[PDB]
Each structure stands twice: as structure tokens, then as C-alpha cells.
Design a protein around this nucleic acid. Structure first.
Lengths: 50, 63, 100, 77
RNA sequence: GGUGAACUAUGCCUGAAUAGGGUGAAGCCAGAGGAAACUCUGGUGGAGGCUCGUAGCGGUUCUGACGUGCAAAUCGAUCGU
RNA sequence: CAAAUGAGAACUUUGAAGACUGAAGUGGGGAAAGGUUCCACGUCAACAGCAGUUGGACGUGGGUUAGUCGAUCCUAAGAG
RNA sequence: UAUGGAUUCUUCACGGUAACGUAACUGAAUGUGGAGACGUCGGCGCGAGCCCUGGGAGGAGUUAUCUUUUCUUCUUAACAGCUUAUCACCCCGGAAUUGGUUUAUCCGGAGAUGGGGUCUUAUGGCUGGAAGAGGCCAGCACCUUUGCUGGCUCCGGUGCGCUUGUGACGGCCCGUGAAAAUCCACAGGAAGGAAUAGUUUUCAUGCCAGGUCGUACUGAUAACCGCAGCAGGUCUCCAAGGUGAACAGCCUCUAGUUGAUAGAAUAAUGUAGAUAAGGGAAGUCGGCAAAAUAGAUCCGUAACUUCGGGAUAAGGAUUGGCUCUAAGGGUCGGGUACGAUCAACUUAGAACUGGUACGGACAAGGGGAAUCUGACUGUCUAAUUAAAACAUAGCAUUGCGAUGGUCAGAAAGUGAUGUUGACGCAAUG
């Protein structure tokens, strides 16, 4: 909704920042098994439902 | 090329619909470089982009 | 009531180009301008004067620049001079025939 | 936004000490179809308002533009 | 021992929406007939949980389509209002 | 239909046609809801039940400016 | 927070007969009033925008032939001043031969008509804003930042038009259609002030500041919910031309799309549309499905009836085009009975005409005679039953006079009816 609240916009911002793929450099760390971001979100696939 | 942005911009700049905006099929490169409202204004002033005339709806039979 | 509206047409450019006959164009004007609804009933109401290069139509009855442009367009379409000459008003009632 | 009718109210408005700009607009209009006169609008810009004095006489406009002190910033346009 | 009235049921509070026609209620104006009482006629007017019928709301029939569907209830015509 | 783009075009872009929605629209805005889907650039592995050079996809970014619009204030059914 | 203006040796203003007017023109406690603040429908009036339309100033289209032609631009915001109003109100005067007057019938000795005024500013007009903007044209200088230079942007008309707003009214109800914050005003007359000065910041001008949060986009045959880019569902504003009664259907303008896996062929059976000689329900549980009817005008219309209906009953006829005819209106006066200009669409006739066709597509009732049943309008089994079921008005019965009836609560210094009182509440048929 266009007329949001500040809490809703803060949640928007947090989810926006979290929605990003794995940095190319962390994949090269020693003893590192994390290959990709397993918590990725699309606005169509999964709703934040807040 | 892909001049969807340019067609939308030309409609917005010159005040008619995308159905009336005419883009020159021989200046595709120039229109492609034009990526601002100022450049689209340059184009419409240069005649590269031309407002199509309004489709006629005569009232003669009605009159 | 007897206000004389004067519409001047500059034919200098087509005359110099050599593809226009101002005398014939003016003659077409007198013999095709219709007054009250019928042609030739210009009972000394409108006159066309030719100086060779600028044709002037003076009028006391109902006459308009839109009428004059319509007549000129009809003549250039009859003579197949369209797509070559434009009828453009430089000033109010100061029309001309442009070539380039 | 406020229109001034009298020269005396115009000249007591000029010396109000809150005026910084005075714009003069030259207009062409029609008194008779054969006599298009010139109109002058002196737009004095106060803090709250824009006053516009109107003059249809070229001579009166000239005398007003002369009597206006040169200290005020006059934009002629 | 807890969670639900975002569907739906029912109140309440505050908002919004609903072409064009048919009929012609009370009230009012004039006229005719008549001894009278009164009776009659023509207008006007614009009532109704009135009526034909869009939007809307619903869902009669085809027991039509579909029926491993568009859809765990939809689609089309025909319908109720 | 043609041209351009491209390794590749039924599907992209441009032009020319032919159409449709037909102002209780397939138009222009909004409410709830969504949450960045908006816009540009690059790009086609997967997705768009054919294709794809296109995309609401993928990657990187940019973008939402108020004394006057709204909340904020008031009270309603009510909650407490 | 200061200056001007206003107000004083009659300290807190004048004018108007009055309605009331003005630039101001003290005003505490206390009290009161108003605005906020209100339903719906109908017709009428006014305005805005849109539609339509004439001349003129530009641009575009057609031009075998015709058309002064077809399409398009000619715009004015918030805000300031002046002015403009139906309704109301004042003054004079005193009315039946009652008069005024609305589309609608109400008003007048509680003072009508008439004459003269006052007011509200919805609304409109002029000016300022503001042509300097916007738009339409023409031209100039060109890997040029890109601009600049000339013109124009004018004047009308109409309406049962559409939509919206407004006003004065009328109808409806056993229904009479929020509250509060806020703002103003009045009543009263506490306090204070005047002759070298004061009173207001409800007159004008002037100075300062205005924080926080939202704001992109979709809003749906792809941005929401249905497991999905699902034929489903989901609130609302704006709304051009023609036909037509019509935000019907059908065709167009502005705007928007051209998105639904495609190519070839045209077998059977399908799904959706149709047409059929003669018969005309013989089909079938049953006329299911389909057909027939259908708009408008005129004519005619039965039984029955709760007199309102039935009723569009039943049943007939007409309908095009073209050329005419007729009727229906608004704006000025003789020295204080004769005429002139224009929009505009309704209705009724007359010829003529044609492959007797004409609501020519679209759109668009089949009807009648009965029986059973429910009075009706309305409601329900979302997703197999819309019904004769439920509701209903009407009728009747029952309880209860408040320390009460009916019903809640584990209790309660607790509750619903109840902001109620037998013309009420409660419980039933």
C-alpha cells in the first residue's frame, strides 16, 4: 500500500537489503561450504506476509 | 535496437499517444542514442520523430 | 458593411521557377470563386488584380483565407503542382506559394 | 495580485520601504479596431503582494517612469 | 488448555452505488349536465416494499459445456430481481 | 509485408497495413493488498506449459523531496 | 513587533427612519447562541465542464467530378478588489369586483398588490494574477552547448442535450435520517486609559518559523487472494460522436492493445452456431431444446375482482425514401390597429415513388381456458433441493407495574431488554 507506516517501510528496507546473492569472494574462503544464498526471495514466489 | 523507451519518452514529451508517435525507420541509431527527454525533444524538433495526424472522424454524414 | 478585406498571394518563387502561370491562376480564381453559392455572381463584390508576380484579391462580400487556400489547393491539384508548392501565410492575409 | 488604480496610491506604495523590485510590462491592446493603443503595467513587488498599476496613456506612463526614483530596481520587460 | 468472524451468519457505526421506459395514487385547475343533491369530463401532478428493462445483486432450465476442467463450483445461453 | 538487431526471429524493435476494446473501455487514476514488481544498463543457464535477441526473469545500479496532500487532531459503534 | 490609519477638553466611532453599512471602532469572570451538523426521491430553475454550432486567423486531408469543404489550434489556475441572488428582511400604503402567483396552489389586515430599499455571495462578469505562461503557425543560424527571430492566440449562438454542483420547492415514514474536537458571536460590564499623551495587533503594511512519518509502481485475463503469469474473486472517480427512449446492442474519435504454441488438411464422432420440402408434438415422463411473438403509432380489449387491477389481456392495422403542407416561440412602439430578426424539434396530414419492401442489421412479450398450492414484495440449504419451505403484514394467546417479567454471569458494589414503562418489553402459535 502506498500509505505505509514506518515499521512497514523498515521491514521493506530490511528485506530489500537481504535480497541479494552470495558475494563472489566468500565462496573462496577456507573450509567454506556456502555456495549460494539459500534464503533468496522473489516478490512472486514467497510473500513476506507481514 | 529497442526504442520502447524512446517511444514512451516521445509520447510523454510531445503530448500525444504512442499510437500517434512516429519514429523514423532510417534513423534507428540516432533514436537509440537519444535516451533523455532533451534528446527526444531534439529529435522531434529535427523531424526524426513526428506526431502522426489525428485519425479523421468526420461529422459530415451526421450534419 | 463595406469593409474591404485584402488578401495578397505572392507567386514570385513559382514564377521564377517557371512552372506557374499567375495569370491563369488568377483567371481560375475569378471563374471559380462563387458568391452567395453560385459562381460568376460576383456583382462587383470581389476583385482579383495581377501585377505579374503578386495576385491580390479584394473583397466586400463574404470571403476568407481558408476559402482562398481551398481554391489555391484545388488549382494546384488540377495542375498537379501539389507535393511541389505549399500555400503558406507569412502574415495575416499575406499568403505565398513556397517551392523549397 | 492586487491591482492599483490611483497614481497617488502607487506613489505612496513605492515609498513603503518593503519594495525591492518593480517590473514594467509593455502591452499592445485594442481600444478601437483601427486604434491599437499601448498599455503599461507597473508591477511593484511587495512582501505579501504584487501590486499592478495600469496606464493606458503613453505620456502618463512616461512621466511615471521618470518620476520613479532610480534607487528602486526596475526590470523593464 | 488454547487460536480463529480476512470466508460466512447477524446486529451496530461511518461512507458509497443504482440507464431509459409503462402505469398513473393523493393534492390542485377548468368545464359540462342537473331544480336540487350530486354526477360526469378534460388537464395538472408524480405516489407505489408497482411494473418492462441496463449496471448491480442472485442462480431457473438446458439436468448444455467442462467434468485427470479456466476453475476443489467455472463457462455459455436462458433466467429472478 | 518489409527492414533492423542477432549465431538463430511467427513471437524483439521500427515502418506500413488490417483489426479490436468503443468513454458501466482492453483508456486515465486511486483504496485494500503486494513490496521495488518502477527506471536504466548488461544479459538468456533456469522461468514465461512453443520460441525468445523480449520480460513483472537473472546481474549491477538509480529512483519516492511537502507548513498547504494524508497521517498526526476529534469523536462514532466500540475498546479499555 | 513597529509604522501608518482609526479612536480623546462628550474618554472606549460614526451613518441610515429601518432592514443594515463602513477599513478600524476597549471588553474580564460568568452565561447563552450559531457554525461544525447531516436521509432519500421527484420535477423546476441557475451555473461549470462537455456536446453542438457561425464568422475569422493558422496547419493537415480529399480533389476523375463536387464540396466557401472534411479534421485539427484559437486556453486562462489558486488567490485580491469591485460587482452580480433566488430566498429572506425593511419603509410607504391599506386590499372583495379578492388579488399575486408556481410546472407543481400556496400567500395576504399577523398587512397582499404596487413603489422604494437592505442582505447572504452558491454562481456569474470585469480587472489584477496574465501572456511574460501554454498552444498553433512561419523562418534562421547547424560533428555546434542549441537557441533565437516574427505572426496569431479574436468575436459570437443555441438547447426538454449529458454529467456535476447549487437553489427554491414538493413527496415519504409507527423510519424523521451521528457525535466531538474546533471556530465565531452575543449578553454582562471587571479592569484600564485620556491633553503631550493613550487605546488595537478582530484596519493596512511589515518580521520569524512551521518538526515527524507516507509518497516509486501495479491495482489485475500477469505486480492482490485463489499452490500458477488460474476464463474465478476483489471497493471507487472521470466518461466523446452516430443510431436509438436509452452509461442497451451495433459502428467510430482520443487513449490502449493487437496478448492467448504454430503450420498443413478438411475424415468419422463431437462443442458452438444455422437451415430445412410435406406433416405439425405423431417424439418424450413432460413441448425438454428450438421456433413463433417482440419497438413505436392508431384501433379494440373478456371472465373475474379486494374496484386498485386483470391489461401490452385476447385480437387487428400501419411503419421506408423523397417533395411538400400545417400547428406549436423568444426579443421593440405610435400624440404622455399595422410589423422586424433568430436559433429549435415535436406532432399531424398530402401527393409521388419501389420486385408490397420498410422496429429492413441490432434490439425485441407467445397467448388463452382451467386445477393444486403459497396472498403479495422478500429469505435459505456457498458446492446436487429456491420450493408448496422460512419471513411477512394481519389475527390470537401468555407473562410482567420495576424489591418486576424474559434472559446473561464462577462471582461481583456485575449485567441485556433499558437513553425502556403496558399504544412497552418479553414468550409463543
Amino acid at each position: 500500500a502506498a500509505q505505509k507506516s514506518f515499521r512497514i517501510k523498515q521491514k521493506m528496507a530490511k528485506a530489500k537489503k537481504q535480497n541479494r546473492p552470495l558475494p563472489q569472494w566468500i565462496r573462496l574462503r577456507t573450509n567454506n561450504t556456502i555456495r549460494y544464498n539459500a534464503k533468496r526471495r522473489n516478490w512472486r514466489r514467497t510473500k513476506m506476509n507481514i | 535496437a529497442n526504442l520502447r523507451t524512446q517511444k514512451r519518452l516521445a509520447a510523454s514529451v510531445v503530448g500525444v499517444g504512442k499510437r500517434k508517435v512516429w519514429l523514423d525507420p532510417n534513423e534507428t541509431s540516432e533514436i537509440a542514442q537519444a535516451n533523455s527527454r532533451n534528446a527526444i525533444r531534439k529529435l522531434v524538433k529535427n523531424g526524426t520523430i513526428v506526431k502522426k495526424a489525428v485519425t479523421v472522424h468526420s461529422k459530415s454524414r451526421t450534419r | 458593411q463595406k469593409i474591404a478585406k485584402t488578401f495578397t498571394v505572392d507567386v514570385s518563387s513559382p514564377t521564377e521557377n517557371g512552372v506557374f502561370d499567375p495569370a491563369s491562376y488568377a483567371k481560375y480564381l475569378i471563374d471559380h470563386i462563387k458568391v452567395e453559392g453560385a459562381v460568376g455572381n460576383l456583382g462587383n463584390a470581389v476583385t482579383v488584380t495581377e501585377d505579374g508576380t503578386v495576385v491580390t484579391v479584394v473583397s466586400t462580400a463574404k470571403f476568407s483565407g481558408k476559402y482562398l487556400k481551398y481554391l489555391t489547393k484545388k488549382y494546384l491539384k488540377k495542375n498537379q503542382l501539389r507535393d511541389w508548392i505549399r500555400f503558406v501565410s507569412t502574415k495575416t492575409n499575406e499568403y505565398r506559394l513556397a517551392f523549397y | 495580485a492586487r491591482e492599483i488604480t490611483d497614481i497617488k496610491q502607487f506613489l505612496e506604495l513605492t515609498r513603503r520601504a518593503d519594495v525591492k523590485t518593480a517590473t514594467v510590462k509593455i502591452n499592445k491592446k485594442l481600444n478601437k479596431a483601427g486604434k491599437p493603443f499601448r498599455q503599461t503595467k507597473f508591477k511593484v513587488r511587495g512582501s505579501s503582494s504584487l501590486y499592478t498599476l495600469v496606464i493606458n496613456d503613453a505620456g502618463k506612463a512616461k512621466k511615471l517612469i521618470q518620476s520613479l526614483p532610480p534607487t528602486l530596481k526596475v526590470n523593464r520587460l
